[PDB]
UniProtKB/Swiss-Prot annotation, chain A:
Main localization (coarse): nucleus
Protein name (Swiss-Prot/TrEMBL): DNA-directed RNA polymerases I, II, and III subunit RPABC1
Any GO BP: transcription by RNA polymerase I
Similarity comment: family membership: Belongs to the archaeal Rpo5/eukaryotic RPB5 RNA polymerase subunit family.
PANTHER family: DNA-DIRECTED RNA POLYMERASES I, II, AND III SUBUNIT RPABC1
Transcription is among the record's keywords: yes
Described function: DNA-dependent RNA polymerases catalyze the transcription of DNA into RNA using the four ribonucleoside triphosphates as substrates. Common component of RNA polymerases I, II and III which synthesize ribosomal RNA precursors, mRNA precursors and many functional non-coding RNAs, and small RNAs, such as 5S rRNA and tRNAs, respectively. Pol II is the central component of the basal RNA polymerase II transcription machinery. RNA polymerase complexes are composed of mobile elements that move relative to each other.
Gene Ontology molecular function, alphabetical: DNA binding; DNA-directed RNA polymerase activity
Domain of life, per lineage: Eukaryota
Subcellular location(s) of the protein: Nucleus
Pfam families, per the entry: RNA_pol_Rpb5_C, RNA_pol_Rpb5_N
From Swiss-Prot, chain B:
Organism: Saccharomyces cerevisiae (strain ATCC 204508 / S288c)
Location of the protein in the cell: Nucleus
Domain of life: Eukaryota
First and last residues shown, out of full length: 877 to 925 of 1460
Record's protein name: DNA-directed RNA polymerase III subunit RPC1
Other remarks in the entry: Present with 6020 molecules/cell in log phase SD medium.
Curated annotation (Swiss-Prot), chain D:
Other comment: Present with 6090 molecules/cell in log phase SD medium.
GO cellular component: cytoplasm; nucleoplasm; nucleus; RNA polymerase I complex; RNA polymerase II, core complex; RNA polymerase III complex
Residues of the full protein shown: 71 to 153 of 155
Family: Belongs to the archaeal Rpo6/eukaryotic RPB6 RNA polymerase subunit family.
Protein role: DNA-dependent RNA polymerases catalyze the transcription of DNA into RNA using the four ribonucleoside triphosphates as substrates. Common component of RNA polymerases I, II and III which synthesize ribosomal RNA precursors, mRNA precursors and many functional non-coding RNAs, and small RNAs, such as 5S rRNA and tRNAs, respectively. Pol II is the central component of the basal RNA polymerase II transcription machinery. RNA polymerases are composed of mobile elements that move relative to each other.
Protein name: DNA-directed RNA polymerases I, II, and III subunit RPABC2
Taxon lineage: Eukaryota, Fungi, Dikarya, Ascomycota, Saccharomycotina
Subcellular compartments: Cytoplasm; Nucleus
Length: 215, 49, 146, 83, 146
């Protein structure tokens, strides 16, 4: 079969682009050159002569930018590792967790192909210095932040959150809430208590801003 | 049928939105002082005007 | 054996290719999978809108879900020639989605953050709510207009 | 519980419809309880109409206390609230 | 004045930077649309002036001869025809701005308003005139949409 191979090649290329954009707006040095990658170029790099897409050397490390680090000082490198099994196992999870911990990354992105084990719910939280965000390769085929229905969510620094809660004289419990595992809270890597500013657009009130806090 | 079902959605939405009122800092809040809209309609404008 | 899915999505009722009173052709599908249709090739995943608020919320998030609530209520009120100011609809969408999840206007959705034993009683399901509040010893403040 | 000084007041300098209705009701209740009035009645005997006249002359001696959702308040005398 | 999310001012190069949007943007767009409407009126007058042979003074004049009236040579006929067709006095512009600003101020939602209950009745009143069963216009032959 070649149709299934071509389809998987295109889908993985689109997912790689989605992760590139998601790293770019989560704030890291990723440029339009390595974001815009044609399907032929992606095949020329991340494939073998049989055409089966490899998910080993596609993994890349990105680092925060000067503007991003100026906003958030305690942000470090990002390491995103792809998996290559229908359901992944306990051993590879330990390998990647130890890899992240020893390379001293503030967080790591785990992208699996089809599904993950139930025992993985217990192992992924146990990492004090870092955090591991797990996706589904399908769940980042097309990024949700480019949809016409999704308005611009913007992560606010601690200082910006303090000013907001002071300008409105609020406490965090009074802000509107955005859930954890909200498809945009995951894309932006929001943590509990983080405040995001939503630039939403109406028809009879132009462009205005709302806010939500992650619970 | 309409006379039987008159004031059904009205009552249901009344239970939903009954306690929301505009505040003196231009915010719409619940009776629990939680912010629903930081400003009404993103405009602050009354549809009656 | 004949009634198995060899191609297509195992949730779509059917598919129709349509004309929006113009010259470009789109397909309005009758299924329950939006992630799959956005991910299918030849479809713009960026511009793909279902009628299903709970499907938008799971796929796109709470802000796109409230956009969907607003747009669908406006569509339902504009096909009938009703004139409702959009700020009322925006307020309805906000009250439905400000807790972070799309909460209904039902006896279950209203049990969001209220703790209002008396408001819940005066709406519906009186004795269950009353005995629950007595059992957990709920200390609700009196703030609701009810 | 803190009073915002008259120098820096963020709320509207306009009497709202609710504030007008409440001011009229309170002042009419006071008048019906034989409170002295500060306008020329000219045959009027009804407390609500007397209070409407006092509001038209901006002579009602009451203060609006506008509580902010944080707990602070600011005081607007009925004379200064513009209608 | 536009501030950042931290509270400081903005660089005059990123006022519309799409993230420094805040409140007061509806009022900013109202002021802009007022200016644009008056600009359209002034452009109508200027194009009449150009057509009647005189200068279209849509832009302030920067030259030595600004102080004298720029219509002195105009032969008292095209002048009075222009004053016949378009004649916008300062009193008119000031009264228009006063009315528009006063109405914009009046439009603001008054604190204390039971805006949630008003929205509830505003979304549930027009609903009390639409059929519970699905009725459709004859000949539409669409999908049986609720």
């Amino acid at each position: 079969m070649d149709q299934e191979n071509e389809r998987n090649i295109s889908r993985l290329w689109r997912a790689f682009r989605t992760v590139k954009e998601m790293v770019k707006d989560r704030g890291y040095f990723i440029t339009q050159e390595e974001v815009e990658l044609p399907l032929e170029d992606f095949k020329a790099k991340y494939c073998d002569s049989m055409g089966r897409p490899q998910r080993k050397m596609m993994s890349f490390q990105a680092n925060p930018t000067e503007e991003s680090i100026s906003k958030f000082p305690d942000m470090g490198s990002l390491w995103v590792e792809f998996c290559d099994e229908p359901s992944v196992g306990v051993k590879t999870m330990k390998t990647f967790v130890i890899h992240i911990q020893e390379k001293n990354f503030q967080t790591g992105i785990f992208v699996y192909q089809n599904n993950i084990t139930p025992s993985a719910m217990k192992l992924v939280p146990s990492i004090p210095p870092a955090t591991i965000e797990t996706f589904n390769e399908a769940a980042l085929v097309v990024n949700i932040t480019h949809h016409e229905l999704v308005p611009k969510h913007i992560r606010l620094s601690s200082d910006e959150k303090r000013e907001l809660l002071k300008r409105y004289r609020l406490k965090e419990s009074q802000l509107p809430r955005i859930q954890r595992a909200d498809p945009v809270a995951l894309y932006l890597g929001l943590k509990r208590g983080e405040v995001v500013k939503i630039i939403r657009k109406s028809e009879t009130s132009g462009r205005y801003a709302s806010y939500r806090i992650c619970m | 049928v309409k006379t039987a079902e008159t004031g059904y959605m009205s009552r249901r939405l009344m239970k939903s939105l009954e306690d929301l009122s505009c505040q003196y800092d231009n915010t719409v809040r619940t009776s629990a002082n939680g912010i629903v809209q930081f400003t009404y309609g993103g405009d602050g404008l009354d549809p009656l005007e | 054996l004949p009634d198995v899915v060899v191609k297509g999505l195992p949730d779509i009722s059917r598919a129709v290719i349509n004309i929006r009173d113009d010259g470009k052709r789109e397909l309005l599908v009758e299924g329950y999978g939006l992630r799959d249709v956005m991910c299918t090739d030849g479809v713009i995943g960026s511009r793909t809108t279902t009628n299903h608020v709970l499907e938008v919320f799971s796929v796109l998030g709470i802000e796109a879900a409230r956009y969907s609530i607003i747009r669908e209520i406006n569509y339902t009120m504009s096909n009938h020639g009703m004139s409702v100011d959009p700020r009322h609809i925006q307020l309805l969408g906000d009250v439905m989605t400000y807790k972070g999840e799309v909460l209904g206007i039902t006896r279950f959705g209203l049990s969001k953050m209220r703790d209002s034993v008396l408001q819940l009683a005066s709406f519906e399901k009186t004795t269950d709510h009353l005995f629950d509040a007595a059992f957990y010893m709920k200390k609700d403040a009196v703030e609701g207009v009810s | 519980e803190k009073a915002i000084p008259k120098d820096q007041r963020a709320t509207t300098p306009y009497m709202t419809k609710y504030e007008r209705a409440r001011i009229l009701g309170t002042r009419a209740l006071q008048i019906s309880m034989n409170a002295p009035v500060f306008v020329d009645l000219e045959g009027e005997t009804d407390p609500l109409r007397i209070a409407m006249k006092e509001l038209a002359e901006k002579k009602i001696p009451l203060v609006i206390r506008r509580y902010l959702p944080d707990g602070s308040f600011e005081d607007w005398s009925v004379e200064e609230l513009i209608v | 004045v536009r501030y950042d999310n931290s509270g400081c001012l903005v660089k005059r190069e990123d006022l519309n930077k799409a993230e420094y949007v805040d409140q007061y943007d509806a009022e900013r767009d109202f002021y802009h649309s007022l200016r644009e409407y008056i600009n359209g009126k002034a452009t109508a007058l200027a194009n009449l002036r150009k057509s009647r042979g005189m200068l279209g003074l849509l832009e302030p004049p920067a030259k030595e001869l600004q102080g004298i009236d720029p219509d002195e040579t105009v032969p008292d006929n095209v002048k009075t025809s222009v004053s016949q067709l378009y004649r916008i006095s300062e009193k008119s512009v000031r009264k228009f701005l006063e009315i528009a600003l006063f109405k914009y101020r009046k439009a603001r939602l008054e604190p204390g308003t039971a805006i949630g209950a008003i929205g509830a009745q505003s979304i549930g009143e027009p609903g009390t005139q639409m059929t519970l069963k699905t009725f459709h216009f004859a000949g539409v032959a669409s999908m049986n949409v609720t």
